[PDB]
Design a protein around this ligand. Structure first.
Ligand code: K
Ligand code: NA
Lengths: 312, 315
Protein backbone atom coordinates (compact mmCIF):
# COMPACT_ATOMS: atom_id res chain seq x y z
CA UNK A 1 0.00 0.00 0.00
CA UNK A 2 1.52 3.29 -1.21
CA UNK A 3 1.52 5.85 1.55
CA UNK A 4 2.73 8.64 -0.77
CA UNK A 5 1.07 9.33 -4.01
CA UNK A 6 2.52 11.91 -6.43
CA UNK A 7 0.47 13.27 -9.31
CA UNK A 8 2.78 15.24 -11.49
CA UNK A 9 5.38 15.49 -14.18
CA UNK A 10 8.09 13.30 -15.66
CA UNK A 11 10.71 15.03 -17.78
CA UNK A 12 13.74 13.68 -19.69
CA UNK A 13 16.67 16.05 -19.16
CA UNK A 14 18.96 16.40 -22.30
CA UNK A 15 21.99 18.10 -20.89
CA UNK A 16 24.91 19.61 -22.78
CA UNK A 17 28.03 20.88 -20.88
CA UNK A 18 29.91 23.72 -22.49
CA UNK A 19 32.46 26.37 -21.59
CA UNK A 20 30.31 29.40 -22.64
CA UNK A 21 26.55 29.75 -23.14
CA UNK A 22 25.77 30.45 -26.79
CA UNK A 23 24.19 33.73 -27.93
CA UNK A 24 21.44 34.07 -30.55
CA UNK A 25 22.68 32.82 -33.97
CA UNK A 26 25.58 30.81 -32.50
CA UNK A 27 26.77 27.27 -32.96
CA UNK A 28 29.12 26.13 -30.24
CA UNK A 29 30.67 22.88 -29.21
CA UNK A 30 30.23 21.41 -25.78
CA UNK A 31 32.43 18.65 -24.25
CA UNK A 32 29.77 16.31 -22.80
CA UNK A 33 26.15 15.36 -23.33
CA UNK A 34 24.06 13.16 -21.06
CA UNK A 35 20.46 12.16 -20.37
CA UNK A 36 19.07 12.52 -16.90
CA UNK A 37 15.69 12.04 -15.27
CA UNK A 38 13.81 15.07 -13.99
CA UNK A 39 10.39 16.64 -13.60
CA UNK A 40 9.28 18.01 -10.28
CA UNK A 41 6.77 15.20 -9.66
CA UNK A 42 9.13 12.41 -10.36
CA UNK A 43 11.94 14.14 -8.44
CA UNK A 44 9.84 14.46 -5.32
CA UNK A 45 8.61 10.90 -5.65
CA UNK A 46 12.15 9.60 -6.04
CA UNK A 47 13.45 11.31 -2.96
CA UNK A 48 10.48 10.05 -0.92
CA UNK A 49 11.01 6.52 -2.14
CA UNK A 50 14.77 6.56 -1.41
CA UNK A 51 13.89 7.53 2.18
CA UNK A 52 11.91 4.21 2.31
CA UNK A 53 8.40 5.49 1.40
CA UNK A 54 6.04 3.21 -0.58
CA UNK A 55 5.12 5.63 -3.38
CA UNK A 56 3.04 5.63 -6.50
CA UNK A 57 3.59 7.95 -9.42
CA UNK A 58 0.61 9.07 -11.45
CA UNK A 59 1.89 10.64 -14.63
CA UNK A 60 1.91 10.39 -18.37
CA UNK A 61 4.81 9.91 -20.72
CA UNK A 62 5.11 9.21 -24.40
CA UNK A 63 4.85 5.84 -26.03
CA UNK A 64 8.39 6.31 -27.13
CA UNK A 65 11.95 5.51 -26.12
CA UNK A 66 12.23 8.29 -23.53
CA UNK A 67 9.01 7.20 -21.89
CA UNK A 68 10.01 3.53 -21.69
CA UNK A 69 13.32 4.61 -20.12
CA UNK A 70 11.39 6.83 -17.64
CA UNK A 71 9.26 3.95 -16.59
CA UNK A 72 12.37 1.88 -16.07
CA UNK A 73 13.84 4.77 -13.97
CA UNK A 74 10.79 4.76 -11.70
CA UNK A 75 10.97 1.02 -11.28
CA UNK A 76 14.69 1.16 -10.47
CA UNK A 77 13.79 3.48 -7.58
CA UNK A 78 11.03 1.06 -6.36
CA UNK A 79 8.23 3.48 -7.23
CA UNK A 80 4.96 1.83 -8.32
CA UNK A 81 4.18 2.56 -11.99
CA UNK A 82 0.64 1.12 -11.81
CA UNK A 83 -0.65 4.58 -12.90
CA UNK A 84 2.10 5.75 -15.21
CA UNK A 85 0.29 6.23 -18.50
CA UNK A 86 1.86 6.28 -22.02
CA UNK A 87 0.36 8.03 -25.06
CA UNK A 88 1.11 8.13 -28.83
CA UNK A 89 -0.35 11.61 -29.04
CA UNK A 90 2.62 13.46 -27.65
CA UNK A 91 6.26 12.90 -26.80
CA UNK A 92 7.66 12.47 -23.31
CA UNK A 93 8.24 15.85 -21.61
CA UNK A 94 11.74 17.23 -22.19
CA UNK A 95 14.03 19.79 -20.73
CA UNK A 96 16.95 20.85 -22.92
CA UNK A 97 19.65 22.19 -20.71
CA UNK A 98 22.88 23.82 -21.62
CA UNK A 99 25.30 24.38 -18.70
CA UNK A 100 28.54 26.35 -18.79
CA UNK A 101 31.61 25.99 -16.49
CA UNK A 102 30.32 28.63 -14.00
CA UNK A 103 27.36 26.33 -13.51
CA UNK A 104 24.95 28.80 -15.21
CA UNK A 105 22.39 27.51 -17.59
CA UNK A 106 19.68 27.98 -20.20
CA UNK A 107 16.76 25.67 -20.18
CA UNK A 108 14.00 24.92 -22.75
CA UNK A 109 11.08 22.98 -21.44
CA UNK A 110 8.53 21.14 -23.71
CA UNK A 111 5.92 19.62 -21.34
CA UNK A 112 4.52 17.20 -23.95
CA UNK A 113 2.74 14.13 -22.67
CA UNK A 114 2.64 15.60 -19.13
CA UNK A 115 -0.11 17.96 -20.32
CA UNK A 116 -2.32 15.09 -21.36
CA UNK A 117 -2.71 13.40 -17.96
CA UNK A 118 -6.41 13.93 -17.45
CA UNK A 119 -9.22 13.40 -15.03
CA UNK A 120 -10.08 9.98 -16.35
CA UNK A 121 -6.47 8.87 -15.79
CA UNK A 122 -6.84 10.00 -12.12
CA UNK A 123 -10.20 8.48 -11.53
CA UNK A 124 -8.56 5.08 -12.25
CA UNK A 125 -6.11 5.81 -9.42
CA UNK A 126 -9.01 6.45 -6.96
CA UNK A 127 -8.47 3.34 -4.78
CA UNK A 128 -4.77 4.01 -4.51
CA UNK A 129 -5.34 7.67 -3.55
CA UNK A 130 -7.97 6.73 -0.96
CA UNK A 131 -5.54 4.47 0.83
CA UNK A 132 -2.56 6.89 0.86
CA UNK A 133 -1.41 9.17 3.63
CA UNK A 134 -0.21 12.00 1.43
CA UNK A 135 -0.99 13.30 -2.07
CA UNK A 136 1.67 15.55 -3.66
CA UNK A 137 1.13 17.91 -6.64
CA UNK A 138 2.94 20.71 -8.43
CA UNK A 139 2.13 22.95 -11.38
CA UNK A 140 3.85 21.17 -14.30
CA UNK A 141 0.78 19.32 -15.47
CA UNK A 142 -2.57 20.74 -16.54
CA UNK A 143 -3.78 22.77 -13.58
CA UNK A 144 -7.28 21.20 -13.75
CA UNK A 145 -5.77 17.73 -13.36
CA UNK A 146 -3.83 18.80 -10.20
CA UNK A 147 -6.95 20.34 -8.76
CA UNK A 148 -8.93 17.22 -9.28
CA UNK A 149 -6.21 15.15 -7.59
CA UNK A 150 -6.23 17.43 -4.57
CA UNK A 151 -10.08 17.35 -4.54
CA UNK A 152 -9.99 13.56 -4.53
CA UNK A 153 -7.40 13.46 -1.70
CA UNK A 154 -9.52 15.86 0.37
CA UNK A 155 -12.63 13.78 -0.13
CA UNK A 156 -10.87 10.60 1.06
CA UNK A 157 -9.26 12.39 4.06
CA UNK A 158 -5.73 12.21 2.58
CA UNK A 159 -3.25 14.96 3.46
CA UNK A 160 -2.49 17.30 0.55
CA UNK A 161 0.97 18.74 -0.04
CA UNK A 162 1.01 21.34 -2.82
CA UNK A 163 4.19 22.91 -4.33
CA UNK A 164 3.12 25.77 -6.66
CA UNK A 165 6.09 25.46 -8.99
CA UNK A 166 6.73 26.91 -11.43
CA UNK A 167 4.74 29.77 -9.91
CA UNK A 168 2.11 31.73 -11.84
CA UNK A 169 0.87 35.27 -10.97
CA UNK A 170 -2.86 34.45 -11.38
CA UNK A 171 -3.20 31.12 -9.56
CA UNK A 172 -6.69 29.61 -9.18
CA UNK A 173 -7.85 30.36 -5.58
CA UNK A 174 -8.92 26.75 -5.01
CA UNK A 175 -5.30 25.61 -4.87
CA UNK A 176 -4.95 27.40 -1.48
CA UNK A 177 -8.21 26.12 -0.01
CA UNK A 178 -7.40 22.51 -1.10
CA UNK A 179 -3.90 22.52 0.42
CA UNK A 180 -3.13 21.11 3.82
CA UNK A 181 0.53 22.07 3.32
CA UNK A 182 1.50 24.74 0.83
CA UNK A 183 5.26 24.78 0.23
CA UNK A 184 7.23 27.18 -2.01
CA UNK A 185 10.50 29.04 -2.30
CA UNK A 186 11.18 32.78 -1.97
CA UNK A 187 11.24 33.25 -5.64
CA UNK A 188 7.81 31.58 -6.09
CA UNK A 189 6.29 33.49 -3.15
CA UNK A 190 7.38 36.80 -4.88
CA UNK A 191 5.38 35.75 -7.94
CA UNK A 192 2.33 34.58 -6.07
CA UNK A 193 2.14 37.58 -3.70
CA UNK A 194 3.90 40.36 -5.68
CA UNK A 195 5.97 41.11 -2.59
CA UNK A 196 9.73 41.17 -2.20
CA UNK A 197 11.16 38.21 -0.37
CA UNK A 198 14.87 38.38 0.52
CA UNK A 199 14.85 37.57 4.22
CA UNK A 200 13.01 35.57 6.84
CA UNK A 201 11.32 38.85 7.92
CA UNK A 202 10.01 39.39 4.34
CA UNK A 203 8.93 35.79 4.02
CA UNK A 204 6.77 35.96 7.15
CA UNK A 205 4.76 38.79 5.51
CA UNK A 206 4.38 36.86 2.27
CA UNK A 207 3.40 33.66 4.10
CA UNK A 208 0.67 35.47 5.90
CA UNK A 209 -0.77 36.70 2.58
CA UNK A 210 -0.88 33.04 1.51
CA UNK A 211 -2.23 31.80 4.78
CA UNK A 212 -5.12 34.30 4.51
CA UNK A 213 -5.94 32.97 0.98
CA UNK A 214 -6.84 29.71 2.76
CA UNK A 215 -3.88 27.33 3.19
CA UNK A 216 -3.73 25.34 6.41
CA UNK A 217 0.06 25.39 6.64
CA UNK A 218 2.39 27.65 4.64
CA UNK A 219 6.14 26.96 4.28
CA UNK A 220 8.49 29.31 2.42
CA UNK A 221 11.98 27.92 1.85
CA UNK A 222 14.90 30.30 2.03
CA UNK A 223 17.77 28.26 0.54
CA UNK A 224 20.74 28.49 2.91
CA UNK A 225 18.68 30.36 5.58
CA UNK A 226 16.31 27.36 6.05
CA UNK A 227 12.60 28.15 6.03
CA UNK A 228 9.65 30.03 7.62
CA UNK A 229 6.46 28.32 8.57
CA UNK A 230 2.99 29.50 9.62
CA UNK A 231 -0.28 27.61 10.20
CA UNK A 232 -3.94 28.30 11.07
CA UNK A 233 -3.29 27.01 14.58
CA UNK A 234 0.10 28.86 14.92
CA UNK A 235 -0.08 31.99 12.75
CA UNK A 236 3.08 33.62 14.04
CA UNK A 237 5.81 33.09 11.42
CA UNK A 238 8.47 30.78 12.71
CA UNK A 239 11.90 30.68 11.24
CA UNK A 240 13.68 27.30 11.16
CA UNK A 241 17.42 27.75 10.48
CA UNK A 242 19.81 25.23 8.72
CA UNK A 243 23.54 24.54 9.52
CA UNK A 244 25.59 26.08 6.64
CA UNK A 245 26.65 23.39 4.10
CA UNK A 246 29.19 23.46 1.18
CA UNK A 247 27.03 23.54 -2.04
CA UNK A 248 28.27 21.68 -5.16
CA UNK A 249 25.05 21.77 -7.19
CA UNK A 250 21.66 23.03 -5.85
CA UNK A 251 19.62 21.63 -8.79
CA UNK A 252 16.68 19.64 -7.56
CA UNK A 253 17.25 20.71 -3.94
CA UNK A 254 13.70 22.11 -3.61
CA UNK A 255 12.36 18.83 -4.90
CA UNK A 256 14.47 16.91 -2.47
CA UNK A 257 13.03 19.04 0.33
CA UNK A 258 9.38 18.46 -0.76
CA UNK A 259 9.96 14.74 -1.15
CA UNK A 260 11.44 14.50 2.31
CA UNK A 261 8.54 16.47 3.63
CA UNK A 262 6.05 14.07 1.95
CA UNK A 263 7.91 11.19 3.55
CA UNK A 264 7.65 12.68 7.05
CA UNK A 265 3.98 13.69 6.64
CA UNK A 266 3.29 10.11 5.69
CA UNK A 267 5.37 8.04 8.08
CA UNK A 268 6.06 10.42 11.06
CA UNK A 269 2.75 12.30 11.38
CA UNK A 270 3.36 13.03 15.07
CA UNK A 271 6.65 14.84 14.63
CA UNK A 272 6.29 18.56 15.17
CA UNK A 273 6.23 20.56 12.00
CA UNK A 274 9.52 22.26 13.10
CA UNK A 275 11.16 18.86 13.50
CA UNK A 276 9.97 17.66 10.10
CA UNK A 277 11.29 20.84 8.49
CA UNK A 278 14.71 20.46 10.24
CA UNK A 279 15.07 16.94 8.91
CA UNK A 280 13.83 17.85 5.42
CA UNK A 281 16.26 20.75 5.28
CA UNK A 282 19.09 18.35 6.24
CA UNK A 283 18.23 15.88 3.55
CA UNK A 284 17.97 18.58 0.91
CA UNK A 285 21.35 19.90 2.03
CA UNK A 286 22.87 16.48 1.41
CA UNK A 287 21.48 16.58 -2.13
CA UNK A 288 23.14 19.94 -2.78
CA UNK A 289 26.53 18.36 -2.02
CA UNK A 290 26.48 16.16 -5.14
CA UNK A 291 25.95 16.95 -8.76
CA UNK A 292 22.85 15.89 -10.62
CA UNK A 293 19.31 15.96 -9.67
CA UNK A 294 17.87 12.48 -8.93
CA UNK A 295 21.31 10.95 -8.75
CA UNK A 296 22.19 13.33 -5.88
CA UNK A 297 19.20 12.32 -3.71
CA UNK A 298 20.36 10.37 -0.67
CA UNK A 299 19.15 6.96 0.33
CA UNK A 300 18.06 6.15 3.87
CA UNK A 301 21.00 3.76 4.29
CA UNK A 302 23.43 6.70 3.80
CA UNK A 303 21.82 9.08 6.21
CA UNK A 304 22.16 9.33 9.98
CA UNK A 305 19.81 7.11 11.87
CA UNK A 306 18.53 10.05 13.98
CA UNK A 307 16.59 11.29 10.93
CA UNK A 308 14.41 8.15 11.23
CA UNK A 309 13.91 8.07 15.01
CA UNK A 310 11.07 9.51 16.96
CA UNK A 311 10.43 9.85 20.68
CA UNK A 312 7.07 8.87 22.31
CA UNK B 1 30.39 -5.18 -52.16
CA UNK B 2 29.96 -1.53 -51.12
CA UNK B 3 30.90 0.84 -53.88
CA UNK B 4 30.60 3.93 -51.68
CA UNK B 5 32.24 3.98 -48.29
CA UNK B 6 31.59 6.94 -46.00
CA UNK B 7 33.89 7.51 -43.05
CA UNK B 8 32.28 10.19 -40.93
CA UNK B 9 29.78 11.28 -38.33
CA UNK B 10 26.35 10.24 -37.07
CA UNK B 11 24.52 12.85 -34.94
CA UNK B 12 21.19 12.88 -33.19
CA UNK B 13 19.42 16.26 -33.65
CA UNK B 14 17.35 17.23 -30.53
CA UNK B 15 15.26 20.14 -31.68
CA UNK B 16 13.11 22.46 -29.53
CA UNK B 17 10.79 25.06 -31.14
CA UNK B 18 10.11 28.20 -29.14
CA UNK B 19 8.79 31.74 -29.53
CA UNK B 20 11.94 33.49 -28.07
CA UNK B 21 15.54 32.29 -27.59
CA UNK B 22 16.39 32.09 -23.85
CA UNK B 23 19.13 34.20 -22.14
CA UNK B 24 21.51 33.25 -19.26
CA UNK B 25 19.63 31.95 -16.22
CA UNK B 26 16.36 31.61 -18.17
CA UNK B 27 13.99 28.74 -18.34
CA UNK B 28 11.52 29.05 -21.19
CA UNK B 29 8.74 26.86 -22.53
CA UNK B 30 8.80 25.77 -26.14
CA UNK B 31 5.81 24.28 -27.96
CA UNK B 32 7.37 21.37 -29.74
CA UNK B 33 10.30 18.99 -29.45
CA UNK B 34 11.47 16.36 -31.95
CA UNK B 35 14.38 14.07 -32.74
CA UNK B 36 15.96 13.89 -36.17
CA UNK B 37 18.84 11.90 -37.71
CA UNK B 38 21.77 13.99 -38.87
CA UNK B 39 25.53 14.17 -39.14
CA UNK B 40 27.16 14.99 -42.47
CA UNK B 41 28.58 11.55 -42.99
CA UNK B 42 25.39 9.74 -42.45
CA UNK B 43 23.37 12.26 -44.43
CA UNK B 44 25.65 11.84 -47.46
CA UNK B 45 25.54 8.09 -47.12
CA UNK B 46 21.73 8.06 -46.93
CA UNK B 47 21.36 10.07 -50.13
CA UNK B 48 23.83 7.80 -51.93
CA UNK B 49 22.01 4.73 -50.78
CA UNK B 50 18.56 6.06 -51.81
CA UNK B 51 19.96 6.58 -55.32
CA UNK B 52 20.76 2.79 -55.39
CA UNK B 53 24.39 2.79 -54.21
CA UNK B 54 25.68 -0.13 -52.10
CA UNK B 55 27.20 1.93 -49.24
CA UNK B 56 28.98 1.28 -46.03
CA UNK B 57 29.05 3.72 -43.12
CA UNK B 58 32.19 3.69 -41.02
CA UNK B 59 31.30 5.63 -37.89
CA UNK B 60 31.02 5.29 -34.15
CA UNK B 61 27.96 5.83 -32.02
CA UNK B 62 27.16 5.16 -28.36
CA UNK B 63 25.95 2.06 -26.75
CA UNK B 64 22.79 3.89 -25.81
CA UNK B 65 19.27 4.37 -27.09
CA UNK B 66 20.22 7.07 -29.65
CA UNK B 67 22.96 4.86 -31.08
CA UNK B 68 20.70 1.80 -31.45
CA UNK B 69 18.15 4.02 -33.16
CA UNK B 70 20.85 5.34 -35.46
CA UNK B 71 21.94 1.86 -36.46
CA UNK B 72 18.24 0.99 -37.13
CA UNK B 73 18.04 4.17 -39.27
CA UNK B 74 21.05 3.11 -41.34
CA UNK B 75 19.65 -0.40 -41.87
CA UNK B 76 16.27 1.01 -42.83
CA UNK B 77 18.08 2.85 -45.64
CA UNK B 78 19.90 -0.34 -46.71
CA UNK B 79 23.31 0.88 -45.59
CA UNK B 80 25.85 -1.62 -44.33
CA UNK B 81 26.54 -1.22 -40.62
CA UNK B 82 29.39 -3.73 -40.43
CA UNK B 83 31.70 -0.90 -39.37
CA UNK B 84 29.26 1.23 -37.50
CA UNK B 85 30.95 0.75 -34.15
CA UNK B 86 29.16 1.24 -30.82
CA UNK B 87 31.00 2.19 -27.71
CA UNK B 88 29.89 2.28 -24.09
CA UNK B 89 32.56 5.01 -23.46
CA UNK B 90 30.76 8.04 -24.90
CA UNK B 91 27.25 9.05 -25.88
CA UNK B 92 26.12 9.21 -29.47
CA UNK B 93 26.97 12.60 -31.05
CA UNK B 94 24.28 15.20 -30.47
CA UNK B 95 23.23 18.54 -31.76
CA UNK B 96 20.89 20.42 -29.49
CA UNK B 97 18.97 22.98 -31.44
CA UNK B 98 16.65 25.66 -30.17
CA UNK B 99 14.70 27.57 -32.87
CA UNK B 100 12.55 30.68 -32.38
CA UNK B 101 9.74 32.04 -34.57
CA UNK B 102 11.99 34.44 -36.51
CA UNK B 103 13.71 31.13 -37.55
CA UNK B 104 16.92 32.04 -35.61
CA UNK B 105 18.64 29.42 -33.59
CA UNK B 106 21.08 28.32 -30.94
CA UNK B 107 22.97 25.11 -31.62
CA UNK B 108 25.16 23.07 -29.24
CA UNK B 109 27.11 20.27 -30.77
CA UNK B 110 28.70 17.53 -28.72
CA UNK B 111 30.53 15.24 -31.09
CA UNK B 112 30.78 12.39 -28.49
CA UNK B 113 31.38 8.90 -29.78
CA UNK B 114 32.21 10.33 -33.26
CA UNK B 115 35.54 11.63 -31.94
CA UNK B 116 36.50 8.13 -30.80
CA UNK B 117 36.52 6.57 -34.23
CA UNK B 118 40.24 5.93 -34.57
CA UNK B 119 42.80 4.49 -36.91
CA UNK B 120 42.40 0.95 -35.46
CA UNK B 121 38.68 1.13 -36.28
CA UNK B 122 39.60 1.97 -39.86
CA UNK B 123 42.29 -0.71 -40.15
CA UNK B 124 39.51 -3.32 -39.40
CA UNK B 125 37.53 -1.78 -42.30
CA UNK B 126 40.48 -2.19 -44.58
CA UNK B 127 39.06 -4.79 -46.90
CA UNK B 128 35.83 -2.89 -47.31
CA UNK B 129 37.68 0.31 -48.19
CA UNK B 130 40.01 -1.35 -50.62
CA UNK B 131 37.05 -2.79 -52.59
CA UNK B 132 35.08 0.49 -52.87
CA UNK B 133 34.94 2.87 -55.78
CA UNK B 134 34.60 6.02 -53.70
CA UNK B 135 35.61 7.07 -50.15
CA UNK B 136 33.76 10.09 -48.74
CA UNK B 137 35.02 12.11 -45.66
CA UNK B 138 34.19 15.39 -43.92
CA UNK B 139 35.52 17.20 -40.89
CA UNK B 140 33.14 16.14 -38.12
CA UNK B 141 35.34 13.30 -36.78
CA UNK B 142 38.95 13.50 -35.56
CA UNK B 143 40.84 15.06 -38.50
CA UNK B 144 43.65 12.44 -38.18
CA UNK B 145 41.07 9.65 -38.66
CA UNK B 146 39.76 11.29 -41.86
CA UNK B 147 43.30 11.68 -43.16
CA UNK B 148 44.11 8.08 -42.56
CA UNK B 149 40.90 7.03 -44.37
CA UNK B 150 41.80 9.14 -47.36
CA UNK B 151 45.38 7.75 -47.29
CA UNK B 152 44.04 4.20 -47.22
CA UNK B 153 41.71 5.02 -50.16
CA UNK B 154 44.59 6.53 -52.15
CA UNK B 155 46.79 3.47 -51.62
CA UNK B 156 44.10 1.14 -52.93
CA UNK B 157 43.34 3.35 -55.96
CA UNK B 158 39.93 4.35 -54.56
CA UNK B 159 38.59 7.79 -55.58
CA UNK B 160 38.50 10.34 -52.72
CA UNK B 161 35.68 12.79 -52.26
CA UNK B 162 36.42 15.26 -49.48
CA UNK B 163 33.97 17.79 -48.04
CA UNK B 164 35.82 20.11 -45.64
CA UNK B 165 32.80 20.89 -43.39
CA UNK B 166 32.58 22.45 -40.98
CA UNK B 167 35.56 24.43 -42.36
CA UNK B 168 38.66 25.34 -40.27
CA UNK B 169 41.11 28.19 -40.92
CA UNK B 170 44.28 26.15 -40.45
CA UNK B 171 43.49 22.98 -42.49
CA UNK B 172 46.28 20.37 -42.74
CA UNK B 173 47.77 20.70 -46.26
CA UNK B 174 47.53 16.94 -46.82
CA UNK B 175 43.79 17.14 -47.14
CA UNK B 176 44.24 18.95 -50.47
CA UNK B 177 46.85 16.58 -51.91
CA UNK B 178 44.79 13.49 -50.80
CA UNK B 179 41.56 14.74 -52.46
CA UNK B 180 40.57 13.70 -55.95
CA UNK B 181 37.43 15.86 -55.58
CA UNK B 182 37.34 18.68 -53.03
CA UNK B 183 33.74 19.97 -52.56
CA UNK B 184 32.60 22.82 -50.28
CA UNK B 185 30.16 25.74 -50.07
CA UNK B 186 30.90 29.54 -50.39
CA UNK B 187 30.94 29.97 -46.71
CA UNK B 188 33.50 27.20 -46.17
CA UNK B 189 35.67 28.45 -49.03
CA UNK B 190 35.90 31.87 -47.27
CA UNK B 191 37.25 30.18 -44.16
CA UNK B 192 39.72 28.00 -46.00
CA UNK B 193 41.07 30.65 -48.37
CA UNK B 194 40.57 33.76 -46.23
CA UNK B 195 38.95 35.41 -49.29
CA UNK B 196 35.55 36.91 -49.64
CA UNK B 197 33.09 34.77 -51.75
CA UNK B 198 29.88 36.54 -52.62
CA UNK B 199 29.46 35.53 -56.31
CA UNK B 200 30.21 32.88 -58.94
CA UNK B 201 33.08 35.19 -60.06
CA UNK B 202 34.55 35.25 -56.53
CA UNK B 203 33.99 31.51 -56.15
CA UNK B 204 36.14 30.93 -59.21
CA UNK B 205 38.95 32.91 -57.51
CA UNK B 206 38.71 30.98 -54.31
CA UNK B 207 38.57 27.69 -56.20
CA UNK B 208 41.78 28.56 -57.97
CA UNK B 209 43.54 29.14 -54.61
CA UNK B 210 42.42 25.68 -53.52
CA UNK B 211 43.39 24.16 -56.83
CA UNK B 212 46.87 25.67 -56.40
CA UNK B 213 47.11 24.01 -52.90
CA UNK B 214 46.94 20.61 -54.66
CA UNK B 215 43.35 19.41 -55.23
CA UNK B 216 42.67 17.57 -58.51
CA UNK B 217 39.09 18.93 -58.78
CA UNK B 218 37.52 21.73 -56.82
CA UNK B 219 33.74 22.34 -56.57
CA UNK B 220 32.24 25.25 -54.69
CA UNK B 221 28.49 25.05 -54.28
CA UNK B 222 26.46 28.25 -54.44
CA UNK B 223 23.00 27.17 -53.09
CA UNK B 224 20.28 28.24 -55.54
CA UNK B 225 22.90 29.53 -58.07
CA UNK B 226 24.25 25.98 -58.64
CA UNK B 227 28.04 25.55 -58.47
CA UNK B 228 31.38 26.41 -59.92
CA UNK B 229 33.95 23.78 -60.87
CA UNK B 230 37.51 23.70 -61.99
CA UNK B 231 40.20 21.04 -62.34
CA UNK B 232 43.90 20.48 -63.09
CA UNK B 233 42.87 19.60 -66.70
CA UNK B 234 40.38 22.50 -67.03
CA UNK B 235 41.45 25.35 -64.75
CA UNK B 236 39.01 27.94 -66.15
CA UNK B 237 36.19 28.14 -63.56
CA UNK B 238 32.92 26.87 -64.99
CA UNK B 239 29.64 27.99 -63.50
CA UNK B 240 26.92 25.32 -63.67
CA UNK B 241 23.51 26.97 -62.99
CA UNK B 242 20.46 24.91 -61.88
CA UNK B 243 16.65 25.04 -62.29
CA UNK B 244 15.04 27.44 -59.82
CA UNK B 245 12.95 25.77 -57.14
CA UNK B 246 10.66 27.02 -54.38
CA UNK B 247 12.66 26.08 -51.25
CA UNK B 248 10.70 24.63 -48.31
CA UNK B 249 13.68 23.62 -46.12
CA UNK B 250 17.32 23.69 -47.26
CA UNK B 251 18.67 21.76 -44.28
CA UNK B 252 20.84 18.91 -45.43
CA UNK B 253 20.87 20.09 -49.10
CA UNK B 254 24.67 20.29 -49.24
CA UNK B 255 24.86 16.73 -47.96
CA UNK B 256 22.30 15.59 -50.55
CA UNK B 257 24.54 17.12 -53.24
CA UNK B 258 27.69 15.38 -51.95
CA UNK B 259 25.90 12.04 -51.60
CA UNK B 260 24.62 12.29 -55.17
CA UNK B 261 28.04 13.14 -56.38
CA UNK B 262 29.47 10.12 -54.59
CA UNK B 263 26.85 7.95 -56.26
CA UNK B 264 27.78 9.24 -59.73
CA UNK B 265 31.55 8.96 -59.14
CA UNK B 266 31.00 5.35 -58.12
CA UNK B 267 28.53 4.08 -60.67
CA UNK B 268 28.85 6.50 -63.62
CA UNK B 269 32.61 7.18 -63.72
CA UNK B 270 32.58 8.01 -67.44
CA UNK B 271 30.05 10.81 -67.27
CA UNK B 272 31.66 14.19 -67.74
CA UNK B 273 32.13 16.09 -64.49
CA UNK B 274 29.71 18.80 -65.77
CA UNK B 275 27.10 16.09 -66.35
CA UNK B 276 27.54 14.60 -62.88
CA UNK B 277 27.19 18.06 -61.38
CA UNK B 278 24.04 18.90 -63.35
CA UNK B 279 22.45 15.72 -62.01
CA UNK B 280 23.68 16.21 -58.43
CA UNK B 281 22.42 19.84 -58.39
CA UNK B 282 18.95 18.60 -59.49
CA UNK B 283 18.86 15.96 -56.82
CA UNK B 284 19.85 18.42 -54.08
CA UNK B 285 17.17 20.78 -55.27
CA UNK B 286 14.53 18.07 -54.90
CA UNK B 287 15.63 17.71 -51.26
CA UNK B 288 15.00 21.39 -50.59
CA UNK B 289 11.39 21.00 -51.60
CA UNK B 290 10.55 19.04 -48.47
CA UNK B 291 11.17 19.41 -44.75
CA UNK B 292 13.16 17.08 -42.48
CA UNK B 293 16.78 16.51 -43.71
CA UNK B 294 17.16 12.75 -44.45
CA UNK B 295 13.43 12.32 -44.86
CA UNK B 296 13.57 14.92 -47.65
CA UNK B 297 16.22 12.97 -49.67
CA UNK B 298 14.66 11.52 -52.86
CA UNK B 299 14.66 7.87 -53.82
CA UNK B 300 15.61 6.72 -57.27
CA UNK B 301 12.08 5.50 -57.91
CA UNK B 302 10.81 9.08 -57.50
CA UNK B 303 13.32 10.79 -59.72
CA UNK B 304 13.23 11.13 -63.55
CA UNK B 305 14.76 8.22 -65.42
CA UNK B 306 17.19 10.33 -67.42
CA UNK B 307 19.16 10.92 -64.23
CA UNK B 308 20.17 7.25 -64.33
CA UNK B 309 21.00 6.89 -68.06
CA UNK B 310 24.27 7.09 -69.97
CA UNK B 311 24.55 7.14 -73.78
CA UNK B 312 25.35 3.55 -74.89
CA UNK B 313 25.90 2.14 -71.33
CA UNK B 314 23.36 0.06 -69.40
CA UNK B 315 22.94 0.68 -65.58
K1 K C 1 22.38 18.23 -6.42
NA1 NA D 1 14.96 19.34 -47.24
Amino acid sequence: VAAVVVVGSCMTDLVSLTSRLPKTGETIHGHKFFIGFGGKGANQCVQAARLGAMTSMVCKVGKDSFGNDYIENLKQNDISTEFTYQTKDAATGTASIIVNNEGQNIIVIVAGANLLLNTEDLRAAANVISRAKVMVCQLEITPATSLEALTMARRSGVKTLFNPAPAIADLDPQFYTLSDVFCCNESEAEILTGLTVGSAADAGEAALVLLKRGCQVVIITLGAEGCVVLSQTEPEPKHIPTEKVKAVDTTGAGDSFVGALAFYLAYYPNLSLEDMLNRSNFIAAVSVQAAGTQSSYPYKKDLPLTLFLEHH
